[PDB]
Symmetry: C4
Subunit: 283 residues, 4 copies
């Protein structure tokens, strides 16, 4: 049973212990729920203004006396600023409510637009993670690797990547705990991430997985979390993506197949058809 899922979310059960987090919740409910809440508030406030006009008397021209329906639709036409001109206010009180309601309609528009824009400007990174990792020799050292691909044509600026080991350990005091290790990489920063990036942790005598095997990684229930971040040109915003691997998803001795190549007519090409392809020696 894996703790981190492939998408980087955790299976940990949160035991725990309406408006406690309202701004957050307005941004994170589904769009159908969000639009329902806006609509609900919009209908509720029109009904309240409708009652306000009735409480003043018959102050709506061409409205049936005592009709909530006519007062409601006049409220709509006032708050939305349609102002057809058949239902119009009569007297100081009605005209004062109109002045207040028009302000409420404008303020409600500002609020709704603010929330919509805050929901919109949360772009995704558009990054693809290799389905597996590998451990194989590179530049004289066994090296843990995975790789990333850009699925968009715009580039990502000052891109950072982390390979994070999560495992259970024992302190010299005998205390058992899970902790994370942000592994040392050959490249942790790419000034411009463009097409594809192979992320590499050389396993030298300082690596937390130095001397480890498939068996000893499972014994410590080791998992690997990958975080990618950068400033995406398409949005002028920071983006981030995550992924996680289990011990079952490390190919010991594996070598990623090159995705960069030179076509027969000479021009260099990227072939993401090979992105998840890994070569192994079969004995």
């Amino acid at each position: 049973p894996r703790i981190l899922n492939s998408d980087g979310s955790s299976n940990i059960t949160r035991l725990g212990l309406w408006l406690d987090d309202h701004y957050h919740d307005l941004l994170t409910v589904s769009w159908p729920v969000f639009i329902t809440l806006i609509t609900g508030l919009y209908l509720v406030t029109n009904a309240l203004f409708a009652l306000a006009y009735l409480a003043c008397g018959d102050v709506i021209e061409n409205a049936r006396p005592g009709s909530f329906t006519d007062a409601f639709f006049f409220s709509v036409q006032t708050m939305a600023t349609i102002g057809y001109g058949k239902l119009i206010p009569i007297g100081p009180l009605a005209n004062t409510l109109v002045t207040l309601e028009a302000l409420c309609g404008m303020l409600g528009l500002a609020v709704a637009a603010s929330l919509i824009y805050a929901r919109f400007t949360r772009p995704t990174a558009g990054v693809l993670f290799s389905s597996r990792m590998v451990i194989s020799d590179f530049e004289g050292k066994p090296t843990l690797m995975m790789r990333l691909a850009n699925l968009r044509i715009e580039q990502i600026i000052e891109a950072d990547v982390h390979l994070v080991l999560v495992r259970s350990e024992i302190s010299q005091e005998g205390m058992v705990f899970r902790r994370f290790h942000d592994l040392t990489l050959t490249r942790s920063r790419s000034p411009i991430f463009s097409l594809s990036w192979t992320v590499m942790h050389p396993i030298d005598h300082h690596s937390p997985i130095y001397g480890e095997t498939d068996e000893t990684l499972r014994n410590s229930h080791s998992e690997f979390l990958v975080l990618f971040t950068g400033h995406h040109e398409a949005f002028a915003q920071n983006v981030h993506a995550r992924h996680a691997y289990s011990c079952d998803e490390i190919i010991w001795g594996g070598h990623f197949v090159d995705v960069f190549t030179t076509l027969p007519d000479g021009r260099r090409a990227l072939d993401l058809g090979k992105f998840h392809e890994i070569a192994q020696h079969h004995h």
Copy 2:
């Protein structure tokens, strides 16, 4: 008497020495004050336009001659763009004012929406701090610790934490002063803060509190300030939270109770009911 309160604010009295900081003040006044200011400006500018129309003569059809009331509500219906159609402008001057007022109504909407959105997009971190710190042995060293919990389901990216000692000191010149020490941590950066994070300062021979006791920390009026920051997924914005501890809130020999556990049916769980629980040996 503590200088820093538990929430990270200071009790220092600012001795010191209307529109001096207007943008800042518009964003930091309470919402009732903010809405009152918008409403006030909205009513003031309609009155000024009302006087403008009267200064042109009887240029509002169906308006009583010389009536400020009728000119005021016509101004409202024009600036808010309701345009019921009973009060309408007559002649070039009135129609020019309408053209200007409609622009003012649209610009005022843009301004109000800009301020509302700037007030909205200041999210809180949703982080909980342990009510105490502890000092106890971990990995062979006495270690100062506190911990954090995420109260939301979304994660925080590239999370940073600081444990800051603030105390009074004496230079070799004999000058007395208070300064801060950003303490060295075992982990200062969590690429993905998800559920709970124990922040640890090992007290080695380079620590500014090496050899210190409860007595000597009080003698220097030592306090501890914690800053958490990170990029919150729910908002695509950086968030931050702070907390402070006094010497009374350090449990020497204390050990935090585990909040992570494995339920009987095997699945891993987080129990924040234990978040503030600390174990001590009683002699």
Copy 3:
């Protein structure tokens, strides 16, 4: 054939393998396409509301019975909240649709404004790159250099620069690959970039181009990518710019001509007429 073009884009052919990336695409299509899409949606939704009213019967006063045209323009006048007052709704159903349509008109405005603002707030850096690099002796070492100029009067805060070597290499395992080297600079950070900045990589015995010649750089198909980033005062936003050089664009022995000078009357001046000027000794 260069891989990186002068503007920092790559000539690599992306082999590969409607609403799959809709938010991104709405922000990156050309403005004519964007406005066409907004207009299209705006006309489509008015037609749908027009059919809605007709499906209710003859519920639009002064509208010809069964006329899609009259129902369409009444829908426009309702969604845009013009409300001339000739075409008005009749009965509960029509007035309910008006209430829904006004909400749709306001929500569509919020959506369009959110997208327009997200497209707008992606400012350019306003930085000029020297058309060439040079390698010449400075402070006792052969040093690779290029330079930047600010084309605006506002300054750029916490400016970072990278000189990135990209070349083909061979590992001791015999694997061939292209990788990047973020070269060590004398100054990688300028707290305030104001007018012009000469970026320098001293070629010491640790430099990846130590001992290299024009010939050996071409043999490894070496290219140089420059990234500039910083917080632009004019926008209160991070900006970035990029540029790339080939081996043909390095002047060995070249010295940039000073762009800073003191005018005859004593005041210091910047002369960007000399920005691309390089001096060479001719033997």
Copy 4:
């Protein structure tokens, strides 16, 4: 003649060499110019729509035939969506223009609001710089110092400061140039800047001003630039401030007067009346 002014701007004369930078210029022109440009565009586009209606014939009810004035104000009432109801469109062509104009009015509102909000959300840091620097002994070393004060009640998160020496130098090749040195500080980062911060560069044997005097600093025309940056709580935005000092503004042997004190009744206080006060020994 100083190059950097006290406010951090430079006196360097930019020799050099309508819509070349339009987005930048819309955000940086004065507010009167900005509002004039919006108004101008608003009047120009209404005139063009007015001509459009006239080109269709007498398609505006209650409008005088051939009157540009009546067509202009009908355009205003349509683009602003006032729709009084006296001037109304007649026929397919006029009603099509209305549909287009309403869209233009909504798009123009989105554009204006986007620009206004981009102009608004550029907050100032609210930081005060000491009018002078000092050089005096601290913790066994001559130390260059200045200090900062927060003029607001909200705090600044992850605050960074730079003390930057700018001076003219000579390389071993004999080349003369001005360069900057970002000086090593005792504290360059304050996790929470709250009230006042004394910034200190210890002048040890590695300092670029080690062994320097008032005379030798003037000979190299040395100036000192200070940059402050941080995440301001009031805005949830990064802010920055700058200041510069000349050799005339360094008090050799000076000691800043404490701004923190304990009032007679015991509570700690900040007295910014002393912020610019410096003590000197008079011989």
